[PDB]
XYZ file of N, CA, C and O in Angstrom:
504
model
N -51.867 57.897 -3.177
C -51.095 56.707 -3.615
C -51.491 56.247 -5.012
O -50.675 55.611 -5.730
N -52.720 56.509 -5.437
C -53.200 55.966 -6.713
C -52.484 56.589 -7.901
O -52.234 55.920 -8.886
N -52.186 57.906 -7.822
C -51.480 58.555 -8.913
C -50.097 57.881 -9.095
O -49.682 57.613 -10.204
N -49.428 57.615 -7.999
C -48.132 56.989 -8.027
C -48.161 55.563 -8.544
O -47.238 55.133 -9.233
N -49.205 54.826 -8.175
C -49.377 53.455 -8.662
C -49.580 53.476 -10.158
O -48.991 52.666 -10.934
N -50.429 54.414 -10.602
C -50.747 54.445 -12.021
C -49.555 54.893 -12.820
O -49.367 54.382 -13.958
N -48.758 55.797 -12.273
C -47.549 56.274 -12.988
C -46.531 55.120 -13.137
O -45.965 54.917 -14.201
N -46.311 54.368 -12.058
C -45.470 53.119 -12.037
C -45.976 52.047 -13.013
O -45.205 51.345 -13.727
N -47.298 51.867 -13.070
C -47.903 50.962 -13.986
C -48.017 49.537 -13.455
O -48.361 48.601 -14.183
N -47.908 49.415 -12.140
C -48.060 48.100 -11.452
C -48.452 48.302 -10.009
O -48.197 49.358 -9.407
N -49.140 47.268 -9.506
C -49.624 47.169 -8.153
C -48.863 46.008 -7.484
O -48.861 44.967 -8.027
N -48.245 46.235 -6.313
C -47.504 45.219 -5.583
C -48.461 44.727 -4.502
O -48.843 45.469 -3.633
N -48.812 43.462 -4.573
C -49.726 42.889 -3.595
C -48.968 41.793 -2.823
O -48.438 40.848 -3.415
N -48.948 41.950 -1.510
C -48.341 40.996 -0.621
C -49.290 39.909 -0.190
O -50.442 40.179 0.115
N -48.810 38.684 -0.209
C -49.554 37.563 0.372
C -48.608 36.460 0.759
O -47.367 36.555 0.560
N -49.171 35.463 1.446
C -48.429 34.303 1.914
C -49.089 33.116 1.246
O -50.193 32.744 1.634
N -48.436 32.551 0.218
C -49.078 31.546 -0.619
C -49.073 30.091 -0.056
O -48.565 29.151 -0.730
N -49.677 29.930 1.111
C -49.778 28.635 1.772
C -51.135 28.526 2.434
O -51.241 27.877 3.520
N -52.174 29.051 1.753
C -53.482 29.128 2.350
C -54.576 28.892 1.293
O -55.345 29.804 0.924
N -54.624 27.675 0.730
C -55.723 27.391 -0.192
C -57.031 27.489 0.529
O -57.114 27.172 1.678
N -58.093 27.894 -0.166
C -58.230 28.279 -1.532
C -57.959 29.745 -1.852
O -58.194 30.152 -3.009
N -57.441 30.497 -0.905
C -57.215 31.922 -1.079
C -55.933 32.277 -1.823
O -55.984 33.086 -2.735
N -54.838 31.643 -1.417
C -53.534 31.756 -2.161
C -52.728 30.510 -1.914
O -52.552 30.080 -0.798
N -52.312 29.910 -3.002
C -51.454 28.711 -2.951
C -50.673 28.578 -4.241
O -50.910 29.281 -5.231
N -49.655 27.740 -4.192
C -48.823 27.441 -5.375
C -49.383 26.172 -6.082
O -49.547 25.150 -5.465
N -49.713 26.281 -7.343
C -50.386 25.150 -8.037
C -49.301 24.193 -8.616
O -48.106 24.468 -8.474
N -49.732 23.091 -9.260
C -48.785 22.094 -9.860
C -47.801 22.668 -10.897
O -46.761 22.080 -11.138
N -48.126 23.806 -11.504
C -47.220 24.553 -12.378
C -46.255 25.536 -11.701
O -45.494 26.232 -12.390
N -46.326 25.661 -10.375
C -45.578 26.702 -9.656
C -46.130 28.136 -9.726
O -45.428 29.090 -9.457
N -47.385 28.296 -10.098
C -47.976 29.608 -10.211
C -48.788 29.821 -8.954
O -49.325 28.879 -8.432
N -48.778 31.071 -8.473
C -49.563 31.448 -7.341
C -50.911 31.777 -7.856
O -51.077 32.650 -8.721
N -51.910 31.100 -7.274
C -53.267 31.203 -7.699
C -54.182 31.224 -6.429
O -53.723 30.965 -5.285
N -55.442 31.489 -6.663
C -56.449 31.444 -5.637
C -57.410 32.611 -5.659
O -57.289 33.531 -6.470
N -58.402 32.572 -4.748
C -59.428 33.617 -4.668
C -58.838 35.024 -4.521
O -59.323 36.004 -5.167
N -57.822 35.134 -3.662
C -57.158 36.410 -3.428
C -56.388 36.879 -4.632
O -56.304 38.074 -4.869
N -55.805 35.968 -5.350
C -55.073 36.301 -6.580
C -56.067 36.852 -7.611
O -55.768 37.864 -8.318
N -57.235 36.210 -7.728
C -58.225 36.732 -8.653
C -58.675 38.138 -8.283
O -58.876 39.030 -9.162
N -58.825 38.396 -6.979
C -59.308 39.674 -6.502
C -58.202 40.748 -6.774
O -58.477 41.868 -7.235
N -56.966 40.372 -6.490
C -55.807 41.275 -6.755
C -55.780 41.641 -8.279
O -55.530 42.801 -8.621
N -56.013 40.640 -9.143
C -55.989 40.847 -10.616
C -57.058 41.825 -10.996
O -56.860 42.714 -11.876
N -58.210 41.675 -10.384
C -59.340 42.568 -10.684
C -59.101 44.007 -10.239
O -59.515 44.939 -10.922
N -58.508 44.195 -9.056
C -58.177 45.505 -8.570
C -57.144 46.164 -9.484
O -57.269 47.320 -9.873
N -56.091 45.426 -9.817
C -55.085 45.980 -10.718
C -55.745 46.339 -12.099
O -55.489 47.422 -12.668
N -56.633 45.470 -12.574
C -57.235 45.644 -13.862
C -58.031 46.927 -13.843
O -57.978 47.742 -14.754
N -58.792 47.109 -12.777
C -59.588 48.314 -12.644
C -58.777 49.598 -12.438
O -59.252 50.686 -12.746
N -57.549 49.482 -11.909
C -56.660 50.597 -11.798
C -55.914 50.912 -13.143
O -55.252 51.954 -13.237
N -56.016 49.988 -14.118
C -55.338 50.024 -15.445
C -53.848 49.698 -15.267
O -53.056 50.188 -15.998
N -53.478 48.873 -14.295
C -52.038 48.562 -14.069
C -51.839 47.068 -14.048
O -52.830 46.329 -13.980
N -50.586 46.600 -14.181
C -50.267 45.224 -14.060
C -50.146 44.871 -12.578
O -50.032 45.729 -11.697
N -50.065 43.601 -12.336
C -50.009 43.028 -10.989
C -48.694 42.343 -10.767
O -48.232 41.553 -11.613
N -48.075 42.626 -9.652
C -46.984 41.801 -9.152
C -47.341 41.273 -7.746
O -47.485 42.092 -6.823
N -47.440 39.936 -7.616
C -47.647 39.294 -6.325
C -46.298 39.146 -5.699
O -45.302 38.633 -6.322
N -46.228 39.604 -4.468
C -45.013 39.456 -3.685
C -45.290 38.453 -2.575
O -45.974 38.780 -1.570
N -44.781 37.250 -2.760
C -45.009 36.188 -1.780
C -44.027 36.306 -0.632
O -42.796 36.535 -0.841
N -44.498 36.128 0.554
C -43.699 36.155 1.737
C -44.298 35.340 2.855
O -45.360 34.855 2.728
N -43.670 35.328 4.028
C -44.336 34.689 5.192
C -45.427 35.583 5.744
O -45.409 36.831 5.583
N -46.474 34.968 6.302
C -47.613 35.768 6.744
C -47.259 36.873 7.743
O -47.712 38.044 7.616
N -46.377 36.550 8.722
C -45.949 37.553 9.702
C -45.121 38.677 9.126
O -44.874 39.711 9.795
N -44.656 38.485 7.923
C -43.948 39.509 7.185
C -44.808 40.556 6.488
O -44.283 41.593 6.017
N -46.094 40.284 6.358
C -46.953 41.098 5.509
C -47.096 42.542 5.991
O -46.858 43.469 5.265
N -47.537 42.735 7.226
C -47.724 44.094 7.753
C -46.370 44.850 7.816
O -46.276 45.942 7.303
N -45.282 44.187 8.250
C -43.988 44.901 8.184
C -43.613 45.354 6.760
O -43.124 46.517 6.554
N -43.871 44.499 5.746
C -43.621 44.866 4.333
C -44.511 45.972 3.850
O -44.119 46.820 3.086
N -45.755 46.025 4.347
C -46.616 47.067 3.962
C -46.162 48.416 4.546
O -46.164 49.441 3.859
N -45.750 48.392 5.792
C -45.264 49.615 6.495
C -44.048 50.180 5.815
O -43.866 51.401 5.729
N -43.183 49.307 5.335
C -41.921 49.720 4.665
C -42.069 49.907 3.216
O -41.066 50.126 2.454
N -43.325 49.912 2.773
C -43.629 50.222 1.377
C -43.037 49.277 0.295
O -42.867 49.697 -0.879
N -42.776 48.032 0.669
C -42.324 46.996 -0.251
C -43.543 46.491 -1.027
O -43.419 45.831 -2.059
N -44.740 46.696 -0.459
C -46.004 46.299 -1.107
C -47.026 47.450 -0.992
O -46.892 48.310 -0.096
N -47.971 47.539 -1.914
C -49.021 48.511 -1.845
C -50.200 48.088 -0.953
O -50.878 48.927 -0.313
N -50.511 46.810 -0.963
C -51.640 46.247 -0.212
C -51.320 44.836 0.173
O -50.456 44.162 -0.406
N -52.093 44.326 1.142
C -52.097 42.915 1.517
C -53.436 42.286 1.115
O -54.511 42.788 1.546
N -53.402 41.190 0.344
C -54.617 40.425 0.033
C -54.277 38.971 0.298
O -53.609 38.286 -0.542
N -54.544 38.522 1.515
C -53.897 37.220 1.962
C -54.703 36.542 3.077
O -54.122 36.112 4.079
N -56.030 36.416 2.875
C -56.775 35.729 3.870
C -56.626 36.364 5.251
O -56.599 35.634 6.280
N -56.519 37.698 5.295
C -56.218 38.438 6.542
C -57.483 38.892 7.257
O -58.243 39.690 6.713
N -57.713 38.308 8.444
C -58.855 38.676 9.219
C -58.770 40.098 9.689
O -57.743 40.593 10.117
N -59.904 40.796 9.635
C -59.965 42.169 10.132
C -60.091 42.064 11.666
O -61.076 41.435 12.212
N -59.099 42.583 12.381
C -59.128 42.513 13.851
C -58.802 43.883 14.434
O -58.135 44.705 13.765
N -59.224 44.141 15.677
C -58.822 45.345 16.330
C -57.356 45.486 16.470
O -56.870 46.608 16.346
N -56.626 44.400 16.773
C -55.173 44.473 16.829
C -54.550 45.003 15.524
O -53.699 45.899 15.551
N -54.987 44.468 14.381
C -54.425 44.914 13.108
C -54.864 46.303 12.746
O -54.083 47.053 12.115
N -56.060 46.697 13.172
C -56.517 48.056 12.916
C -55.666 49.117 13.644
O -55.696 50.280 13.255
N -54.848 48.713 14.620
C -53.976 49.681 15.279
C -52.882 50.135 14.361
O -52.271 51.199 14.555
N -52.542 49.260 13.412
C -51.353 49.505 12.530
C -51.660 49.781 11.047
O -50.928 50.566 10.377
N -52.760 49.169 10.526
C -53.146 49.348 9.142
C -54.608 49.677 9.032
O -55.410 49.573 10.019
N -54.989 50.100 7.860
C -56.415 50.271 7.487
C -56.905 49.035 6.698
O -56.131 48.363 6.016
N -58.187 48.721 6.804
C -58.774 47.594 6.065
C -59.889 48.094 5.183
O -60.673 48.992 5.603
N -59.998 47.501 4.002
C -61.234 47.650 3.173
C -62.425 47.071 3.901
O -62.286 46.372 4.905
N -63.567 47.221 3.277
C -64.760 46.478 3.663
C -64.457 45.025 3.531
O -63.567 44.617 2.761
N -65.127 44.180 4.288
C -64.860 42.796 4.196
C -65.192 42.215 2.824
O -66.191 42.590 2.213
N -64.356 41.333 2.313
C -64.651 40.712 1.028
C -64.938 39.223 1.110
O -65.276 38.582 0.108
N -64.749 38.635 2.273
C -65.142 37.278 2.522
C -65.618 37.166 3.977
O -64.946 37.640 4.890
N -66.769 36.527 4.187
C -67.305 36.283 5.516
C -67.258 34.783 5.801
O -67.927 33.979 5.104
N -66.470 34.357 6.792
C -66.250 32.933 6.937
C -67.461 32.240 7.504
O -67.680 31.056 7.290
N -68.183 32.978 8.315
C -69.264 32.338 9.131
C -70.690 32.702 8.779
O -71.632 32.102 9.307
N -70.887 33.639 7.866
C -72.247 34.038 7.485
C -72.849 35.035 8.472
O -72.509 35.037 9.687
N -73.715 35.893 7.916
C -74.357 37.007 8.625
C -73.381 37.953 9.304
O -73.690 38.513 10.355
N -72.195 38.124 8.712
C -71.159 38.998 9.272
C -70.551 38.494 10.563
O -69.897 39.256 11.269
N -70.779 37.211 10.878
C -70.229 36.588 12.084
C -68.895 35.854 11.785
O -68.587 35.380 10.647
N -68.076 35.811 12.827
C -66.807 35.184 12.742
C -65.914 35.990 11.802
O -66.150 37.172 11.511
N -64.908 35.302 11.320
C -63.800 35.941 10.650
C -64.300 36.670 9.374
O -65.063 36.057 8.577
N -63.933 37.953 9.179
C -64.160 38.590 7.915
C -62.788 38.978 7.351
O -61.987 39.583 8.109
N -62.520 38.682 6.072
C -61.224 39.065 5.489
C -61.322 40.416 4.864
O -62.342 40.756 4.282
N -60.300 41.212 5.044
C -60.195 42.503 4.418
C -58.834 42.694 3.747
O -57.868 41.937 3.962
N -58.793 43.715 2.878
C -57.552 44.120 2.176
C -56.904 45.148 3.066
O -57.550 46.133 3.381
N -55.624 44.949 3.442
C -54.954 45.905 4.322
C -54.196 46.944 3.472
O -53.564 46.573 2.437
N -54.289 48.228 3.899
C -53.765 49.393 3.161
C -53.041 50.251 4.242
O -53.512 50.273 5.402
N -51.932 50.940 3.901
C -51.375 51.868 4.894
C -52.428 52.932 5.209
O -53.169 53.404 4.302
N -52.516 53.302 6.489
C -53.502 54.315 6.906
C -53.479 55.628 6.074
O -54.527 56.273 5.861
N -52.314 55.994 5.550
C -52.269 57.291 4.870
C -52.801 57.239 3.449
O -53.084 58.281 2.847
N -52.965 56.036 2.894
C -53.307 55.872 1.480
C -54.830 55.794 1.363
O -55.434 54.762 1.015
N -55.463 56.956 1.600
C -56.916 56.994 1.708
C -57.609 56.811 0.348
O -58.647 56.169 0.261
N -57.070 57.401 -0.694
C -57.651 57.318 -2.005
C -57.635 55.852 -2.462
O -58.601 55.392 -3.045
N -56.531 55.158 -2.206
C -56.417 53.762 -2.606
C -57.496 52.952 -1.892
O -58.156 52.134 -2.508
N -57.650 53.182 -0.603
C -58.648 52.438 0.173
C -60.039 52.714 -0.393
O -60.839 51.811 -0.545
N -60.326 53.996 -0.665
C -61.647 54.373 -1.203
C -61.937 53.699 -2.528
O -63.030 53.168 -2.795
N -60.903 53.609 -3.353
C -61.031 52.973 -4.632
C -61.263 51.462 -4.476
O -62.133 50.883 -5.155
N -60.508 50.815 -3.571
C -60.673 49.387 -3.376
C -62.099 49.115 -2.888
O -62.715 48.140 -3.306
N -62.595 49.968 -2.024
C -63.987 49.785 -1.534
C -64.971 49.896 -2.671
O -65.925 49.064 -2.765
N -64.774 50.842 -3.591
C -65.653 50.926 -4.780
C -65.638 49.647 -5.615
O -66.671 49.193 -6.068
N -64.460 49.072 -5.839
C -64.316 47.845 -6.590
C -65.040 46.680 -5.916
O -65.698 45.827 -6.564
N -64.902 46.613 -4.605
C -65.509 45.501 -3.881
C -67.066 45.542 -4.001
O -67.729 44.475 -4.195
N -67.568 46.753 -3.929
C -69.063 46.973 -4.092
C -69.494 46.610 -5.476
O -70.577 45.994 -5.666
N -68.666 46.963 -6.471
C -68.920 46.540 -7.875
C -68.854 45.061 -8.071
O -69.619 44.528 -8.840
N -67.908 44.360 -7.421
C -67.839 42.943 -7.563
C -69.084 42.310 -6.866
O -69.506 41.260 -7.403
């Protein structure tokens, strides 16, 4: 998937912008937050621009499956249920400390292994 992303020259990241401080719409109408910063960094490291695709949260995994987005970065807890359908990066936020409780991960289609490997490298670098 990475060759195709780089050839396109942009990364499509899905999120649901109603979850401060991770993603929300600010007083200027811009989507901002922790997840937006992380998406910017991943795109930057891939040498591509970023397009945030805002949608409803329940829409995210369906959009990822249908290839409307490359990844999900949206305050998404890593769960066994979601692991049945998508792949997750290493956790990038731990809500409860010591790896307890909710951990957020970046969701990737299972077949896009190179992309997942690359995102994991970035997360370790951050």
